[PDB]
C-alpha cells in the first residue's frame, strides 16, 4: 500500500488539508502509523509526511496531524540539498530552518523536542538562528532550549547568528546568558565571523558584552580578520575598547590599507592612502624615537620596493597607483606571512589586472610569487596553472617573446603539483575521489598546454634543455588519467579539451611538435590505457587528415620511428589499420609498416591458442600478448 503513502506525502507537502483528510479517512491504527511514519523520497531528500508538512509551512496540515492522530514529533529525515545533506532532522529543525513560526508554535505545544540533537549536533535553535527569525528563537529558548549546545566543530547558536546579518536574534541571545567566548575548531570566536561578514551592530553588541578578544587558531585577531575582509567601519570601533594596546591597532590599520589597495569589489586609492598614512603617522608620531616595523627584503615580484619607512616615502607615492598596489601587497604579506589561506588571492587578482592592462611581465612575476606562496601552504593550485596557460597563450597570440625561465618555473611547479595531486588521489579514498580525479586530469591538461606553449617559443639551448629535463621528470613519473591515457595519448588525441580562453588559439591538439618533444624525453610510446588503445591506435583515428596533414604526418612518423609497434593489438582485437576509419591515415601508417617474422609468428601463435607461458623468453611473453 505504498500508493497511499505516496499520495499522503504529496498531500502533506503541498498543504492539501481536504485531500489528506480524505486519504487518511477509513484507516486503522497500524495503517495510520504506516502512512504517517513512512519515509518518502521526492528528490534528493528522505522525509516523512509530517517533516515535509512542517518544512513547507503548512500549519493546517501539521495541526491536523497532531490533533486527532497520535503522531510523534521525533521522526528522522533529510531537509536540504545545497551542499547540506543532514540526517536526523526532526520536524522542529525543518520548521526552524524554513522559518515558519506558525508551525513551530503548534509543534512544540503538542509534546515536542525543543533541544533535539541531529547527526551533526545541530539544535533546532541553530536553524532558527540561521534563518534569523526572532520569534522562533525566542519561543524555542523560552521553551527550555540549550544555547551552549553546538555541533562537533563548536559552532554555537550565537556564532551562526553572528555570521549572518541578523541583529535582533544576536542581541536577544546576548541578552539571554549566551557565551561570547566560543572557540571553534579553527580557533574562530564569534567576533571573527561577525567582523569578516561586515555587520557593525553584531560586533558592537558583542564588545558591549565583554567579547574577550582572543587570537584565533591561524594567528589572526578579530581586528586582523575585519581589516582583511576590507571592512573599514568594523575595524574603527574596536580601537575604543581600551585593551587593544598600540601594536594591534597599527597592524589592523596597515592590514586594512593593504586590503583596500588590492581588492576587487571595494578597490579604493584615496581610502587606501588615507589609512596607510594614518597607520604610518601613528607609528612615527610617538616622539620617543619611533615605533619601527620589521620589513621583508625587497621581493622581486613587486619590483625592488622595500615598502616605505620614511615620511617622504609615502607622501611621494600618493600619486602612483602601481606603487600603492605593490606596497599593499608587501604589507599584507609581511602581516599575514606566507602560510595564511587568503594571502595569495590579492596577488592573483593584481596579476589578473596587470595582465588585463597589458603588463604581462609584472603579471608573470606576481603570479609566480602567488604559486610559490600557495606551494608553501600546499593549497589547490589547479586553476592557477590553467590561468598561466591562458596568459602564455595570450602572449603567443600577441607575438610576445615569453621568458623561458618563467616557463621553466611554471613547469617545475606544475610537475610538483601533479605529484601532489597523485598523492592526494592515493590518499582521498572515496569522499572526493571524483573531485580529485577531475583535478588530476585538469592538471595534466594544463601541463600539456604549457608544453605546447613551450614548443611555440624559441628558447636558447640551456632553456630548452631545462624544459626537456622537467618534461623528462614528469614523463618518468608516468601520469595516467581516469581513462588510462598517458601524456602521449592526450598529445595525439583530438578529443582532449582545450580551455575556452585564449588557449584555443595556440594549444591545438594533436601536435606533432608536442609529441616529438615528449618522445625526446623518453615517453612510453607503447603505453596502453585501460581500454587497450596505444599511442598509435588513437592518432590514426584523426578526422582531419588533409587540413593539417603535416601535423598528422610528423606525428605518425615520429611515433613509429621512435619505438611504436605498428601491428600491436588492443584489448578489442583490432590492428591499428582496423581502428583507422581514414584512408589517408591508413596509408600513412602502412608506409611505415615493416613486416617482420616476429609479428607473423606472434599472430600465428595467438590465433590458434598455443600455450606460451614460460616456454618463451620473458620479453616475448608481453610481445605475444600485444598481438
Amino acid at each position: 500500500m505504498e500508493g497511499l503513502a505516496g499520495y499522503v506525502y504529496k498531500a502533506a507537502s503541498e498543504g492539501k488539508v481536504l485531500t489528506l483528510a480524505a486519504l487518511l479517512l477509513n484507516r486503522s491504527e497500524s495503517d495510520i502509523r504506516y502512512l504517517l511514519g513512512y519515509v518518502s523520497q521526492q528528490g534528493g531528500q528522505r522525509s516523512t509526511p509530517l517533516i515535509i508538512a512542517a518544512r513547507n509551512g503548512h500549519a493546517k496540515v501539521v495541526r491536523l496531524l497532531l490533533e486527532h492522530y497520535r503522531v510523534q514529533t521525533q521522526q528522522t529525515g533529510t531537509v536540504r540539498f545545497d551542499g547540506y545533506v543532514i540526517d536526523g532532522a526532526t520536524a522542529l529543525w525543518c520548521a526552524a530552518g524554513a522559518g515558519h513560526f506558525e508551525v513551530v508554535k503548534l509543534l512544540v505545544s503538542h509534546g515536542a523536542n525543543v533541544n533535539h540533537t541531529t547527526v551533526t549536533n545541530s539544535t533546532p535553535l541553530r536553524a532558527a538562528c540561521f534563518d534569523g527569525r526572532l520569534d522562533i528563537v525566542k519561543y524555542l529558548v523560552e521553551n527550555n532550549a540549550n544555547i551552549s549546545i553546538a555541533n562537533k566543530y563548536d559552532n554555537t547558536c550565537l556564532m551562526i547568528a553572528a555570521y549572518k546579518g541578523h541583529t535582533d536574534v544576536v542581541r536577544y541571545l546576548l541578552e539571554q546568558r549566551a557565551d561570547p567566548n566560543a572557540k571553534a575548531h579553527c580557533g574562530a570566536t564569534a567576533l571573527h565571523f561577525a567582523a569578516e561578514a561586515g555587520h557593525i551592530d553584531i560586533v558592537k553588541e558583542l564588545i558591549k558584552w565583554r567579547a574577550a578578544i582572543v587570537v584565533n587558531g591561524h594567528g589572526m585577531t578579530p581586528l586582523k580578520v575585519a581589516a582583511e575582509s576590507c571592512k573599514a567601519d568594523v575595524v574603527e570601533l574596536l580601537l575604543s575598547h581600551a585593551d587593544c594596546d598600540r601594536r594591534s591597532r597599527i597592524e589592523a590599520l596597515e592590514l586594512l590599507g593593504a586590503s583596500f589597495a588590492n581588492d576587487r569589489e571595494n578597490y579604493d586609492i584615496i581610502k587606501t592612502y588615507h589609512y596607510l598614512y594614518l597607520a604610518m603617522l601613528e607609528r612615527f608620531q610617538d616622539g620617543d624615537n619611533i615605533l619601527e616595523k620589521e620589513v621583508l627584503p625587497p621581493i622581486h615580484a613587486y619590483g625592488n620596493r622595500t615598502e616605505c619607512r620614511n615620511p617622504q616615502e609615502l607622501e611621494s607615492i600618493r600619486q602612483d597607483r602601481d606603487a600603492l598596489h605593490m606596497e599593499g601587497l608587501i604589507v599584507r604579506e609581511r602581516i599575514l606571512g606566507a602560510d595564511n589561506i587568503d594571502v595569495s588571492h590579492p596577488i592573483i587578482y593584481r596579476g589578473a589586472v596587470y595582465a588585463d592592462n597589458m603588463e604581462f611581465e609584472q603579471c608573470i612575476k606576481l603570479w609566480l610569487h602567488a604559486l610559490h606562496l600557495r606551494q608553501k601552504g600546499n593549497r589547490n593550485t589547479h586553476k592557477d596553472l590553467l590561468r598561466f596557460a591562458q596568459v602564455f597563450s595570450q602572449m603567443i597570440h600577441l607575438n610576445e617573446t615569453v621568458k623561458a625561465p618563467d616557463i621553466e618555473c611554471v613547469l617545475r611547479c606544475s610537475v610538483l603539483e601533479i605529484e601532489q595531486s597523485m598523492n592526494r588521489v592515493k590518499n582521498i579514498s572515496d569522499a572526493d575521489v571524483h573531485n580529485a580525479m577531475d583535478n588530476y586530469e585538469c592538471n595534466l591538461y594544463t601541463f600539456l598546454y604549457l608544453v605546447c606553449i613551450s614548443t611555440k617559443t624559441q628558447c636558447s639551448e640551456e632553456d630548452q634543455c631545462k624544459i626537456n629535463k622537467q618534461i623528462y621528470n614528469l614523463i618518468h613519473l608516468d601520469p595516467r588519467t581516469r581513462e588510462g591515457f598517458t601524456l602521449l595519448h592526450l598529445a595525439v588525441n583530438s578529443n582532449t579539451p582545450v580551455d575556452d580562453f585564449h588557449t584555443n588559439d595556440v594549444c591545438s591538439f594533436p601536435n606533432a611538435l608536442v609529441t616529438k618533444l615528449l618522445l625526446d624525453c623518453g615517453a612510453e610510446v607503447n603505453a596502453v590505457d585501460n581500454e587497450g588503445n596505444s599511442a598509435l591506435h588513437i592518432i590514426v583515428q584523426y578526422n582531419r587528415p588533409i587540413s593539417d596533414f603535416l601535423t598528422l604526418h610528423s606525428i605518425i612518423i615520429s611515433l613509429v620511428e621512435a619505438g611504436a609497434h605498428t601491428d600491436m593489438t588492443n584489448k578489442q582485437n583490432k590492428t591499428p589499420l582496423d581502428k583507422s576509419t581514414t584512408g589517408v591515415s591508413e596509408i600513412l601508417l602502412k608506409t611505415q609498416m615493416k613486416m617482420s617474422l616476429k609479428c607473423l609468428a606472434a599472430r600465428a601463435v595467438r590465433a590458434n591458442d598455443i600455450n606460451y607461458q614460460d616456454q618463451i623468453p620473458r620479453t616475448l611473453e608481453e610481445f605475444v600478448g600485444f598481438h
Binding site: G83, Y84, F130, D131, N151, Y349, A352, V353, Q390
Partner: peptide
C-alpha cells in the same frame, strides 16, 4: 577578460 573569470560550508551548517 582575465579579471572577469575569478568570480567552508561544512562549518556553516544550519
Amino acid at each position: 577578460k582575465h579579471s572577469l573569470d575569478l568570480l567552508k560550508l561544512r562549518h556553516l551548517s544550519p
